[PDB]
């Protein structure tokens, strides 16, 4: 299936270690789709070489470059540099449908059935459930949709300063229209109690939303612990699958 | 509209002060439906007299009495006394459709359009959004449905020990079937940040989920403060509307 792909984003070498675990977990449960990672010039050249060993395409996005399609929007909204870089996922018109996943997510089972969904399909966000969490969403690349999002960013910006705010404003009918575009919470399980004991075993994707990202923990290979099984599995994939590359 | 009603529950005099504010807020925004409160013998006789000044029906429920329909279930599940008392809302077969609201909720605008919904319509719960919050839900009373819930309580109980767990287990298709049965989050806004600045103004019902209930705060009538505008409005309705009764 060279027609569809999983898309992620790395703005530095720290988040690149998260995408390496995400891409390895996508390979571990045997995905038939392509693996795409969007990278900025802040990612070092040697870290991009490590990313090529996991992902099928390492696409460079530099919103600071005047030739970039989102550069004029950046001058109006200089605080949305990361957001405008992520919005380049709609520019990947070589694919018909994609599933974007942030670098701080981890896959626990095959989620290729997400490509049976339409744009825009996303899981509900905890805290404000009438907004979807932009950590995992199924979309369809389009130059039209991409230019629509850039104009919305220039006109209004983002009410949370990130991508989730503007994406919820653009796809504002998500909470009341089609329930098939509501992904189950197990496709984007927030790391932040009795409900977990009943449904947490059916988790497919865990979203690390804590203050300390998984790669910023101090991992002890002797005890296989850190300074909670999901955080241990992240470092297990990182040491077993990612490092020998 | 003597055919439909709002239903609440009071197990003691402390929660009875919350139902007095809830019923007063329902009267403040002019509801055309009946006001029903379920009370246990633990509510004092004089507090029931105060409840009759607000609600149209004060219905007594005593699961400790051997003649109660849920008494045999209580012997199997002695920890679900409050839950089995709340489940008596389905026994109110004199109404065709009802909207249950917990005593720790507060109404900010007319929500009579909730009776355009079907059973079971409820708002998503924050924390685990694939489960609905049982603080506000639209249901249809039925002896059949009530006996179905009692048997589920005897067989499995509740995975959270309260009503929300068993109600989510019984109405398990809520998260994936009809989106019209997904009430907007403003119909049950949890008191527990950038999303509030955009949508919080459209709030219709606020659900006080904090550790300290609104009636357990120390209210100073001089400064109109407590020991945050929703907690102030609760005590304003309590002092202006409830006390002169």
* Per-domain residue ranges of chain A: 1-245
Task: Quote the CA–CA distance of A10 and B37 in Å, as a whole number.
Answer: 55
> Exposed, middle or buried by CB within 10 Å (0-12, 13-18, 19+), for B228?
exposed
- Option in B126, B177, B178 nearest A127 (CB): B126
Q: Residue A192: closest CA among chain B residues belongs to which residue?
A: B127
Q: Could you tell me the end-to-end alpha-carbon distance of chain A, in angstroms, rounded to an integer?
A: 25
Neighbouring CB atoms inside 10 A of A46's CB total 9
- Decide: A189 and A230 in contact? Cβ < 8 Å: no
For residue B96, is it left (φ>0), alpha (ψ between -120 and 50) or beta? alpha
- Does A104 show up as a binding residue in the annotation? yes
Tokens of A198: 């009943």
Q: Is the peptide bond before A231 cis (omega within 30 degrees of 0)?
A: no
Neighbouring CB atoms inside 10 A of A114's CB total 22
Strands B4-10, A205-207: pairing kind: unpaired
Strand partners, B220: B225
Q: Which H or E run contains A107?
A: strand A105-107
Q: Residue B185: closest CA among chain A residues belongs to which residue?
A: A130
Beta strands in chain B (DSSP E): 4-10, 34-39, 57-60, 97-101, 105-107, 121-124, 132-139, 189-190, 205-207
The SS3 of residue B106 is: strand
- Decide: A237 and A244 in contact? Cβ < 8 Å: no
Q: Taking the C-alpha atoms of A63, A65, A66 and A70 in order, what is their torsion angle to the nearest 10 degrees?
A: -10
Beta strands in A173-239 (DSSP E): 189-190, 205-207
Task: Quote the CA–CA distance of B191 and B108 in Å, as a whole number.
Answer: 14
Interchain pair B194, A130: CB under 8 A: no
Q: Which residues of chain B have a CB within 8 Å of the CB of A199?
A: 128, 130
- Among A176, A195, A199, pick the best mutation site for testing chain B contact (most B Cβ within 10 A): A195
Q: Which residues of chain B have a CB within 8 Å of the CB of A182?
A: 175-176, 179
Tell me whether B79 touches chain A (CB under 8 Å).
Answer: no
Backbone CA torsion sign across B22, B26, B28, B29: positive
Q: Which residues of chain B have a CB within 8 Å of the CB of A195?
A: 127-128, 131, 159-160
> Exposed, middle or buried by CB within 10 Å (0-12, 13-18, 19+), for A149?
buried
- Decide: B139 and B155 in contact? Cβ < 8 Å: no
- Decide: B175 and B131 in contact? Cβ < 8 Å: yes
Strands B205-207, B34-39: pairing kind: unpaired
- Does B135 show up as a binding residue in the annotation? no
Q: Could you tell me the end-to-end alpha-carbon distance of chain B, in angstroms, rounded to an integer?
A: 25
Tell me which residue has tokens 């996943």.
A101
Q: Which residues of chain B have a CB within 8 Å of the CB of A126?
A: 126-129
Task: Quote the CA–CA distance of A226 and A220 in Å, as a whole number.
Answer: 6
Q: Which residues of chain B have a CB within 8 Å of the CB of A174?
A: none
DSSP string, B157-209: --TTSSHHHHHHHHTTTTTTS-GGGB--GGGGEE---HHHHHHGGG-SEEE--
Experimental technique for the deposited model: X-ray
The SS3 of residue A191 is: coil
Q: Is the peptide bond before B120 cis (omega within 30 degrees of 0)?
A: yes
Task: Quote the CA–CA distance of B24 and A156 in Å, as a whole number.
Answer: 39
Nearest to B133 by CA among B122, B142, B144, B141: B122
- Decide: B48 and B38 in contact? Cβ < 8 Å: no
Shortest Cα distance from B203 to chain A (angstroms)? 12
- Does A163 show up as a binding residue in the annotation? yes
Tell me whether B162 touches chain A (CB under 8 Å).
Answer: no
Interchain pair B184, A177: CB under 8 A: no
Task: Quote the CA–CA distance of B81 and B65 in Å, as a whole number.
Answer: 12
Neighbouring CB atoms inside 10 A of A75's CB total 9
User: In residues, how long is chain B?
Assistant: 245
User: In residues, how long is chain A?
Assistant: 245
- Does A102 show up as a binding residue in the annotation? yes
- B1-245: CATH class: alpha beta
Residue A64: partners with Cβ closer than 8 Å, 6 or more residues away:
A41, A71, A74, A81
Burial letters B173-207, b for 16+ CB under 10 A, else e: ebbeeeeebbbbbbbbbbeeeebeeebeeebbbbb
Nearest to A18 by CA among A224, A241, A214, A212: A214
- Option in A124, A159, A184 nearest B198 (CB): A159
């Amino acid at each position: 299936m060279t027609d569809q792909a999983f898309v992620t984003l790395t703005t530095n070498d720290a988040y690149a270690k998260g995408a390496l675990v995400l891409g390895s977990s996508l390979k571990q449960h045997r995905t038939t789709r392509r693996l795409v990672v969007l990278a900025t010039p802040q990612v070092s050249d040697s870290m991009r070489k490590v990313l090529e060993t996991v992902f099928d395409e390492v696409i460079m996005v530099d919103v600071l470059d005047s030739g970039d399609s989102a550069h004029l929007t950046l001058m109006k909204r200089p605080e949305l540099g990361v957001t405008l870089t992520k919005l380049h996922c709609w520019s990947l018109t070589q694919y018909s449908k994609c599933v974007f996943m942030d670098a701080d997510t981890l896959v626990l089972a095959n989620i290729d059935d997400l490509f049976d969904r339409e744009e825009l399909s996303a899981a509900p966000d905890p805290g404000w459930p009438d907004c979807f969490n932009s950590g995992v969403f199924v979309y369809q690349p389009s130059v039209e949709t991409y230019n629509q999002l850039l104009h919305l960013a220039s006109e209004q910006g983002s009410f949370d300063g990130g991508d989730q705010g503007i994406l919820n404003t653009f796809f504002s009918s998500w909470a009341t229209t089609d329930i098939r575009k509501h992904l189950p919470f197990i496709y984007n399980l927030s790391s932040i109690l009795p409900a977990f004991k009943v449904f947490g075993a059916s988790a497919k994707v865990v979203h690390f939303l804590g203050r300390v990202k998984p790669w910023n923990y101090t991992y002890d290979p002797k005890t296989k612990s850190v300074k909670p099984e999901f955080l241990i599995l992240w470092w297990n994939i990182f040491t077993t699958n990612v490092l020998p590359l």
